[PDB]
Amino acid sequence: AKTELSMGVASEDVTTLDPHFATTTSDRTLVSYIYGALVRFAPGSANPSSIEADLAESWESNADQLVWTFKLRPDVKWQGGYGNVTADDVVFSLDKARDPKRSAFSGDYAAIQKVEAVDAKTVRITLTRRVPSLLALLSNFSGGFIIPKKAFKERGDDFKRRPVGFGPFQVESIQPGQSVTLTANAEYFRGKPKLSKISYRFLNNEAARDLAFESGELDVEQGNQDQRWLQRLTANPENVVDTIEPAELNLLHINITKPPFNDIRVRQALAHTVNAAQIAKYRGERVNRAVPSVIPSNNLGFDPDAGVLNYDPAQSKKLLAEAGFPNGVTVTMVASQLPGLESLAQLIQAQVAEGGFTLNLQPVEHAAWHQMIRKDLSPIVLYGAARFPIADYYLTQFYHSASEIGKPTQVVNFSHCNVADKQIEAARTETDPNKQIELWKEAQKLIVSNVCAIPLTENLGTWARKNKLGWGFELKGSMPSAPLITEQTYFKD
């Protein structure tokens, strides 16, 4: 039986395999193969209702939902001889995850007061205030992944390149800018993987990646957001196409503090000459959808009536003239070379010329671009992402003033949005589902009318597999919008 899987992704390299820092789809995908968490999404699901036992066998909460106790499975062992997974490892991981100096996702854990190892198999988490979902924070995504205290202490700066998890796969070696070689974790607590090896290959160029998949060089390849790729790959009977939840929302985040965009009329002019409905139609409706708000449509608290500015390029030119620009505006955007983001920026560039904007694009490799946008190097940021499907996540990270670039608490608030802080904070601890949803909708209307960010389309993850490969479960979703490979993944006879 075939046991070695070859996979091709839209990425140039590994940046970090430390789960408290892994942000790009590619790093998050590799991290989902290496690590586990206290709780997890069911394999093949990106649905929170599927949150179930992983390292924690079970858990208990008190009535005020501030104290959560987790009972750890005793049979879970670390990769690379680091022995049994203990409560001390969980305390270390969660204390690191909630630390802004040692984590990119500390903001998610702001409500945590303390994490205690009651005994070797028992973890107690105490919250200062209520969170919409504590289990969400402790799931196998972002800062929820558990790392060994002793392995991080020993490896330090090398840990991001030599990761240690308790997941079904381990990193044997990294071939910088070429591939990651993963081998089966033979001691994986749910059983020995059916696959012996994963060759995870960096194949950014779409035409080259498609050739490699077509020839059989790859068993799995990442697709794009275009219906032609979808049609061509379905036409060959040896392939199966997977359209994966969650959909990642793409927005033009405008830095509201920088001229000419510190004038609301200029931001409104830009919002009126982008055509999200045309983007969805051009790309294809199965994978792509125009979003009538500034957060993905699958979110608890989503506002379908957020008041998104309509397509009116005549109004754009009228607004620009009122703002002192009768001959238009030139904007230079630092643009990611991730092919989907590059194609999207190219379609935006053609569209915004209708309303008087000359959009110049400075192409930069994706991971380097991620660092530049976090140093305020672009006046506008074309960013595509999904978060845990509760409005608090997307709203805090992208639009709360504490998340703005330049602060030690910075997340992904590229727009320097500061209009919905009170509504975001109030919704976070609001008990009843309806008035919590109303505060979230209030936040969305304020973010939209201030034109902090212009929503475009949201896209489901697109991947192709050869018929011979079975995921070992039905693939509907995966939090990174990329396939999950587990101990159940196998090749058919």
Ligand SMILES: O=C(O)CC[C@@H](NCC(=O)[C@H](O)[C@H](O)[C@@H](O)CO)C(=O)O
């Ligand atoms: O989690 C995050 O913060 C980053 C999200 C991660 N997603 C990839 C991405 O932006 C999307 O695929 C994107 O919607 C484009 O391909 C749009 O066509 C990235 O930048 O690699």
Ligand SMILES: OC[C@H]1O[C@H](O)[C@H](O)[C@@H](O)[C@@H]1O
């Ligand atoms: O734009 C085309 C080029 O970009 C791609 O992302 C690859 O890095 C390179 O192999 C290719 O020739």
Ligand SMILES: [Cl-]
């Ligand atoms: Cl990348």
